[PDB]
Design a protein around this ligand. Structure first.
Ligand SMILES: Cc1cn([C@H]2C[C@H](O)[C@@H](COP(=O)(O)OP(=O)(O)OP(=O)(O)O)O2)c(=O)[nH]c1=O
Ligand SMILES: Cc1cn([C@H]2C[C@H](O)[C@@H](COP(=O)(O)OP(=O)(O)OP(=O)(O)O)O2)c(=O)[nH]c1=O
Ligand SMILES: Cc1cn([C@H]2C[C@H](O)[C@@H](COP(=O)(O)OP(=O)(O)OP(=O)(O)O)O2)c(=O)[nH]c1=O
Lengths: 189, 192, 193
């Protein structure tokens, strides 16, 4: 099966991927961003250095890089988790991390949303910082990602699975276990 | 005028249809699932003889049955209200209760949403379970209705159709006052 | 750049449009309803004479009007701000203000949603209902309308890969027109990036 895992940044969406890769073999977890970056570095070596450098690219060249990366990912032949973002905040607004080409090429069985509590995201981004959105911004962002998922579902006829993590953690990294277990229950169902 | 009446199941969405049919001769109320049935058992009487059996069809046959149902419906000259679901909860998440085709074939003027209060929904589902006619919580129902709103808005943006939301969240003086309100609102919509 | 500015009616959407068109250069602000009305008036002068005569037409003729408006609108400049409505409440339920064509013809960089607090909107509408410019919506009606505008914008973004910027003007003002100055600064900051 093919599922696209999404969530707001700085919340634990990478943690679930690490723990899914660990706890389940026969499962290929892939970061769409890393594949796009590698394809870009290969196609534009003399100018692409770090991840941010992908903003230098023209619109159409970047779209082609996305298409190529989706082509690469479509080759994975067993259980697949595609790690990416539905929306990314820009000074110009929320921008889709996906494109219809990705949905058509990868042919994902479904999308998964990881919804958290704003307070959690705040503390989490603080931890990642030591090594500026408000709770309102984060609620807005999550509702926006939800609308994006419902739109992509209405266009491509795919599932949208919302995993709730608003509840308080008795111990740190409880959200991770819950999400990983739900996703594995979903894969073996 | 043709509309797609929808809402979470177990809340009164069929009562509205039946009452509407009682209360308006200039109208035809049809349930998409029931037409899917009639047209499937017309072709596969061997393995399809009860509703819950439709799971057995491959996606090819079942999609063709959906297309044939929407086509048979589209032959209704008079006002039309198509009862169906926007999204169905599954172990894989929500899935659209409509395929783009349906919408194209029917050419619905709009989509009507019936938004209930979650407790009503659960209470109704319990009472309907005890009558031999059948676990979600209030949060799950709120989420389902919100996702239904989002599906209606997406379909409108894609196909250019109205999105009429009917509020049945208020407390009822007497049982089945929600159906009275919804029926009257829809008729008002038609006779304008 | 090209942006489509929207928000519930009677809340301060043309205010921001005017403050923009004046406080910026190379910036052309244009209202979609006005171009629609002008083109319809030209094509059907016999019956188009008030902004409500426009919907005495079949939706196909009106759709052609909308496509012409868009075409006509894009031609105006290489920079733009299109004042329009994401959705409009009607006896049959919220109807889209744009069409998949509008955005293919104008190729807008993004959509902007000015999201207000409904209480402010009620007050503004009834202050407009005293100055001659203006209808009985409530707080919940308006919250639903704004949520529906949000959903429409996100849908169109998913469809055409455009930004959806949301400007929060729900907070209470320290003085009149603080919301408008805030929004104008946000949009300018965005453009001068
Ligand atoms: C699940 C969880 C994460 N965290 C911390 C660990 C992480 O360092 C931080 C952010 O989670 P990340 O694992 O970094 O999630 P991400 O997808 O946003 O990362 P990336 O920038 O690469 O896209 O949150 C907690 O403090 N408590 C928790 O319960
Ligand atoms: C409208 C209404 C229904 N009820 C009861 C009648 C039924 O037992 C149940 C309503 O369920 P139904 O009216 O039968 O609707 P449904 O769940 O079958 O819809 P769908 O097509 O999606 O499957 O609740 C009330 O008690 N009060 C009410 O106001
Ligand atoms: C921003 C703002 C507007 N107002 C008033 C001024 C106007 O009467 C009204 C602002 O709304 P409009 O500027 O008229 O915005 P609009 O184009 O969306 O409305 P319409 O469809 O009617 O053309 O509210 C205030 O009183 N304080 C404020 O801070």
């Amino acid at each position: 099966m093919r599922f696209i895992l999404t969530g707001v940044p700085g919340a634990g969406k990478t943690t679930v991927c690490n723990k899914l890769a660990e706890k389940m073999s026969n499962l290929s977890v892939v970061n769409y961003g890393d594949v796009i970056f590698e394809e870009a570095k290969k196609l534009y070596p003399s100018i692409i250095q770090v991840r941010e450098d992908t903003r230098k690219l023209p619109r159409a060249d970047y779209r082609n890089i996305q298409i190529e990366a989706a082509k690469k990912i479509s080759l994975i032949t067993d259980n697949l988790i595609v790690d990416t973002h539905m929306s990314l905040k820009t000074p110009y607004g929320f921008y889709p991390g996906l494109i219809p080409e990705t949905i058509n090429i990868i042919q994902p069985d479904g999308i998964i949303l990881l919804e958290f509590n704003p307070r959690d995201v705040i503390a989490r981004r603080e931890k990642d910082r030591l090594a500026m959105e408000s709770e309102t911004d984060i609620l807005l962002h999550q509702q926006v990602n939800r609308m994006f998922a419902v739109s992509y579902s209405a266009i491509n006829q795919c599932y949208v699975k919302i995993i709730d993590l608003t509840w308080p953690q008795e111990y740190e990294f409880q959200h991770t276990e819950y999400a990983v277990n739900k996703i594995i229950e979903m894969l073996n169902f």
